[PDB]
């Protein structure tokens with residue numbers, strides 16, 4: 017019996033294949049008159065089409081980190097910044113000095129950050145430039161002179177100086193990253209949940225369901241929930257330093273808004289230009305005062321330890337505090353309302369909660385809840401996109417900026433090893449690891465519809 | 478460009494990063510060593526990738542600002558100096574400011 | 583209604599499990615047949631997609647064409663296979679392999695095989711026309 | 718570029734009435750081959766149809782490939798007209814009926830005829846192995 | 853697929869190398885195969901051109917079907933060619949001219965040659981068909 021050759025067309029095969037994606041957006045989040053900015057510009061609309069054609073005989077394998085779309089999740093917003101960059105104002109093109117210790121303010125403000133200044137060595141050396149209120153917001157006062165410092169303008173020695181103004185858009189728009197036909201995205205979803213070995217429930221989708229990606233240093237707030245169970249992933253389990261992703265079947269908040277109500281005192285200094293001294297008098301007790309109901313908080317953590325058991329059998333869990341450097345790593349960062357979050361989260365990740373066969377040594381919430389409170393930082397000049405040397409000033413604003421929302425996962429790292437006492441430090445690490453959340457359910461391929469096999473039959477000749 | 482730290486410090490057999498942090502608009506990147514003033518030694522042949530010289534203890538890693546070298550198993554050679562090399566602004570070539578590494582303890 | 587891997591590529595996206603019967607079923611499966619302003623921009627990329635599908639499909643059919651078959655969603659040759667690329671018994675291939683296994687147990691002999699197909703085709707159709715050529 | 722014959726392809730208009738003259742000349746019946754910002758929409762919508770018409774034309778080409786009639790304009794295969802099909806007879810069809818009448822007669826049997834083609838083509842392939850299965 | 857090598861379909865780049873040589877190059881060139889506003893307006897015209905290229909390619913492919921050829925790139929036919937217009941003999945064609953002079957040697961008679969290809973293709977079915985039509 018011979019082996020001739022034969023060809024087949026329309027046959028089912030798809031390739032593991034890198035490709036790069038367009039973004040689909042809500043075309044009424046932005047609006048018709050707000051031309052010439054990234055979301056109104058190159059990002060296209062959306063028309064959702066879940067169409068999840070189910071698959072016996074699928075057998076694909078996965079790793080969370082083999083994906084390339086993670087890079088697009090760090091890209092894009094540089095164009096949102098650049099298409100919107102406000103210039104250096106005439107008061108600020110050089111390292112001017114400022115003098116204060118108590119605040120330049122209308123009142124004895126009971127807020128630690130508004131230690132406001134005059135401008136002093138200032139362009140013309142003229143009262144019209146100097147006497148203007150340099151509103152402070154804690155992260156200020158770069159030292160110049162060794163005593164009684166005439167503080168340096170902190171932005172003057174980095175490549176970008178720029179301003180946030182209330183007209184300039186920011187919004188967590190629902191976004192989808194997508195690629196044309198013949199390519200397909202495969203979503204994988206066996207309750208035996210994987211992203212790591214084989215899979216057993218799969219179908220194509222034209223794009224992911226929408227996601228609202230925004231940065232954090234500790235807590236995956238407003239993330240997509242898991243279901244049935246908590247889960248953890250961290251690549252080669254012999255590894256110490258490389259990030260552990262913790263993902264939740266329940267959720268809990270962090271109890272503060274952005275409460276610091278302030279006046280609309282912008283100063284129209286320079287030719288069609290501004291400084292936003294928007295501070296003083298109104299709300300001058302309203303520091304961020306963040307708080308913790310231990311019950312639901314500790315419950316989720318102790319549940320997480322009862323999962324960590326599975327990765328570290330018959331030995332007892334513990335935690336250690338987060339890193340310094342930029343105190344964002346010690347705290348948080350996120351934007352809401354143009355205002356940024358920096359309360360002492362590292363105060364929480366603590367005790368030696370036991371994993372012996374135990375009915376104790378796993379709680380502090382006391383059923384009384386205690387409603388504990390923690391010290392908070394603030395910043396008016398922000399590193400507007402992380403790692404990069406850029407800096408931007410942003411105004412404090414009137415009323416309550418209400419974001420106080422819920423957590424669906426943790427950034428986590430191990431701290432070496434010792435006999436029985438396994439332990440971890442929360443947050444920090446690769447800021448790309450935020451986007452690994454949920455995206456593990458998806459990967460992209462190219463269809464390749466033709467092929468060949470041997471056979472026991474021959475063409476006419 | 479291309480700014481670098483003057484040094485960083487971690488102890489024997491531990492691990493650390495160096496990165497190059499200036500006008501890193503160029504985005505395929507390489508890294509190099511000099512030690513005791515001898516002829517410079519390569520590390521990274523493109524930003525995540527290395528040949529036969531030190532094929533385990535070093536590692537290459539991607540970021541837009543921090544063109545990043547990551548190092549583990551720190552030993553008595555790690556008193557050397559280390560440099561980034563992006564490709565340049567078209568038909569052009571660059572070096573980093575260097576980092577004289579200082580393994581402590 | 584019409585078959586669908588993509589909107590007409592790969593006439594079902596779901597594989598019929600097994601390189602035997604599914605191949606026969608594929609032939610029968612081929613046989614059975616503001617808001618508005620930025621929406622007028624959304625009406626671009628799906629157009630690009632349908633055009634690209636045609637473009638790919640016609641490039642593909644051209645490769646079949648030079649191999650001296652067209653349509654013929656299975657086609658036979660006069661090219662041999664000398665008992666040495668896995669040699670799995672032919673029922674066991676048909677019954678136990680998806681193409682999404684032949685993709686790994688076989689494959690990347692592809693360029694050679696495409697060569698064999700083309701070279702044999704041209705040389706064969708020249709043979710008959712050369713044997714006919716005398717006058 | 719060019720005008721229209723009901724459709725930008727298929728070219729109905731030389732209806733011929735009698736199928737005789739029409740079939741006996743079928744070759745020539747194809748062998749003859751805001752200022753303006755809203756011109757976006759008044760290109761988009763007929764472009765969609767224009768593309769999807771080519772996709773319809775490709776559905777047809779798929780069937781023609783399936784019957785082993787690729788690129789042919791008149792074609793036939795093995796299958797007999799085996800007696801029970803209406804008895805209208807050769808010398809008593811074309812000269813006294815029209816294509817629209819012939820459909821209005823024949824509409825019952827369509828899928829059955831198509832299946833008979835499918836089967837016969839698929840048999841005709843392997844039937845040659847009755848001579849060629851020498852190994 | 854890929855960025856344009858100066859020319860799309862038709863793939864012109866062996867231009868005015870010898871015709872004899874061109875057959876190899878050709879077979880190989882087969883074998884391988886305002887922010888958003890007015891720039892999205894423009895995003896129709898080239899796509900419309902992309903469609904017109906497909907329209908031309910398919911319109912012109914249909915002609916090969918009438919000649920009984922399938923994109924099988926060296927189709928041949930016992931219409932004789934019979935020397936007497938440019939007369940060169942074989943090598944004296946293929947080693948001398950470009951195809952961009954073979955047109956200036958011969959256009960015109962083309963309009964009869966298409967007919968020779970039609971009626972000869974109809975003969976190559978008729979001359980078998982009538983011998984089967986003995987019963």
Ligand SMILES: *[C@@H]1O[C@H](CO)[C@@H](O[C@@H]2O[C@H](CO)[C@@H](O[C@@H]3O[C@H](CO[C@H]4O[C@H](CO)[C@@H](O)[C@H](O)[C@@H]4O)[C@@H](O)[C@H](O[C@H]4O[C@H](CO)[C@@H](O)[C@H](O)[C@@H]4O)[C@@H]3O)[C@H](O)[C@H]2NC(C)=O)[C@H](O)[C@H]1NC(C)=O
Nearest residue numbers: 188230237238350351352353415416417418419420421422
């Ligand atoms: C995580 O999840 C939380 C909770 O779901 C989200 O917080 C909600 O965000 C939306 C959108 O900002 C809020 O809804 C809108 O509130 C406006 C007032 O908002 C204040 O707070 C926001 C920050 O959320 C500031 O930007 C803003 O300046 C204010 O300080 C309303 O104006 C909106 O419309 C309503 O009021 C107007 C009149 O003002 C009416 O004309 C409208 O008809 C309508 O009634 C709108 O309601 C929502 O209030 C927030 N809730 C909470 C509890 O904070 C987070 O945004 C989300 N993401 C992150 C990273 O935390």
Ligand SMILES: *[C@@H]1O[C@H](CO)[C@@H](O[C@@H]2O[C@H](CO)[C@@H](O[C@@H]3O[C@H](CO)[C@@H](O[C@@H]4O[C@H](CO)[C@@H](O)[C@H](O)[C@H]4NC(C)=O)[C@H](O)[C@@H]3O)[C@H](O)[C@H]2NC(C)=O)[C@H](O)[C@H]1NC(C)=O
Nearest residue numbers: 237238239240241264265266267268269420421422423424
């Ligand atoms: C973490 O925080 C987020 C907010 O930051 C929580 O988001 C949403 O929260 C609600 C309450 O927890 C969830 O429950 C559903 O809410 C919708 C909308 O109110 C309800 O739909 C409406 O139901 C009524 C009655 O059946 C019906 O008449 C309406 O027609 C119907 N639709 C609308 C548009 O009103 C629904 O019944 C539930 O009550 C949401 O599911 C949740 N949404 C999202 C996107 O997260 C989140 O729940 C919270 N998670 C945890 C674990 O704390």
Ligand SMILES: *[C@@H]1O[C@H](CO)[C@@H](O[C@@H]2O[C@H](CO)[C@@H](O[C@@H]3O[C@H](CO)[C@@H](O)[C@H](O)[C@@H]3O)[C@H](O)[C@H]2NC(C)=O)[C@H](O)[C@H]1NC(C)=O
Nearest residue numbers: 268271308309310311312313314315381383384385386387
């Ligand atoms: C701190 O967090 C705990 C949970 O860890 C909160 O306790 C839960 O609070 C809800 C809302 O009050 C309780 O539900 C209500 O219960 C009553 C009966 O007690 C019922 O009539 C209502 O319809 C509603 O279901 C829930 O039972 C309670 N759980 C427990 C175990 O006590 C607590 O309220 C939080 N406290 C603060 C100050 O944040």
Ligand SMILES: *[C@@H]1O[C@H](CO)[C@@H](O[C@@H]2O[C@H](CO)[C@@H](O[C@@H]3O[C@H](CO)[C@@H](O)[C@H](O)[C@@H]3O)[C@H](O)[C@H]2NC(C)=O)[C@H](O)[C@H]1NC(C)=O
Nearest residue numbers: 031032666667683684685686687688689690691692693694
């Ligand atoms: C293509 O056909 C070749 C045989 O001609 C198949 O095997 C080849 O095997 C060697 C040794 O495994 C591969 O080298 C390297 O192997 C290690 C360990 O498996 C792997 O980590 C490296 O990435 C690398 O593959 C060699 O590359 C491989 N050839 C190719 C072209 O893949 C091979 O299985 C067939 N591959 C496919 C995709 O059809």
Ligand SMILES: *[C@@H]1O[C@H](CO)[C@@H](O[C@@H]2O[C@H](CO)[C@@H](O[C@@H]3O[C@H](CO)[C@@H](O)[C@H](O)[C@@H]3O)[C@H](O)[C@H]2NC(C)=O)[C@H](O)[C@H]1NC(C)=O
Nearest residue numbers: 802803817818819820821822823824825826827828829830
């Ligand atoms: C197949 O051909 C038939 C006839 O051309 C199409 O019409 C259907 O024909 C039957 C049989 O004549 C009708 O049933 C009954 O027929 C008797 C005798 O003619 C009559 O006395 C009854 O009143 C009744 O009509 C049937 O009703 C008729 N259908 C309709 C909607 O009128 C049939 O549609 C063709 N089918 C296909 C798929 O081509």
Ligand SMILES: *[C@@H]1O[C@H](CO)[C@@H](O[C@@H]2O[C@H](CO)[C@@H](O[C@@H]3O[C@H](CO)[C@@H](O)[C@H](O)[C@@H]3O)[C@H](O)[C@H]2NC(C)=O)[C@H](O)[C@H]1NC(C)=O
Nearest residue numbers: 936937938952953954955956957958959960961962963964
């Ligand atoms: C292909 O066919 C044409 C005839 O259809 C062949 O001859 C060309 O015909 C035109 C029109 O008669 C000639 O132009 C005219 O020439 C006369 C006399 O020189 C002049 O008085 C008119 O003003 C007009 O220009 C054209 O010269 C002629 N070309 C040649 C080269 O003869 C043509 O030759 C045929 N092609 C070949 C290669 O045989």
Ligand SMILES: *[C@@H]1O[C@H](CO)[C@@H](O[C@@H]2O[C@H](CO)[C@@H](O)[C@H](O)[C@H]2NC(C)=O)[C@H](O)[C@H]1NC(C)=O
Nearest residue numbers: 337338339340341343346360361362363364391
């Ligand atoms: C509360 O926040 C402070 C930082 O404001 C944390 O302690 C300091 O952290 C910095 C940065 O890591 C170190 O340089 C200081 O040496 C730390 N001080 C001390 C006394 O350790 C502090 O750990 C947070 N938590 C609590 C419970 O206070």
Ligand SMILES: *[C@@H]1O[C@H](CO)[C@@H](O)[C@H](O)[C@H]1NC(C)=O
Nearest residue numbers: 019662663664665666667668
């Ligand atoms: C056939 O034999 C050749 C050497 O003659 C070898 O390269 C090839 O791998 C063999 N396998 C098949 C199935 O042709």
Ligand SMILES: *[C@@H]1O[C@H](CO)[C@@H](O)[C@H](O)[C@H]1NC(C)=O
Nearest residue numbers: 797798799800801802803829
């Ligand atoms: C052809 O033969 C079948 C049985 O094989 C019979 O049912 C049918 O009536 C016959 N005639 C036609 C024209 O189908």
Ligand SMILES: *[C@@H]1O[C@H](CO)[C@@H](O)[C@H](O)[C@H]1NC(C)=O
Nearest residue numbers: 933934935936937938939961
């Ligand atoms: C071939 O024969 C025709 C007449 O049948 C004649 O007109 C023509 O000149 C000849 N030569 C060529 C190259 O066609």
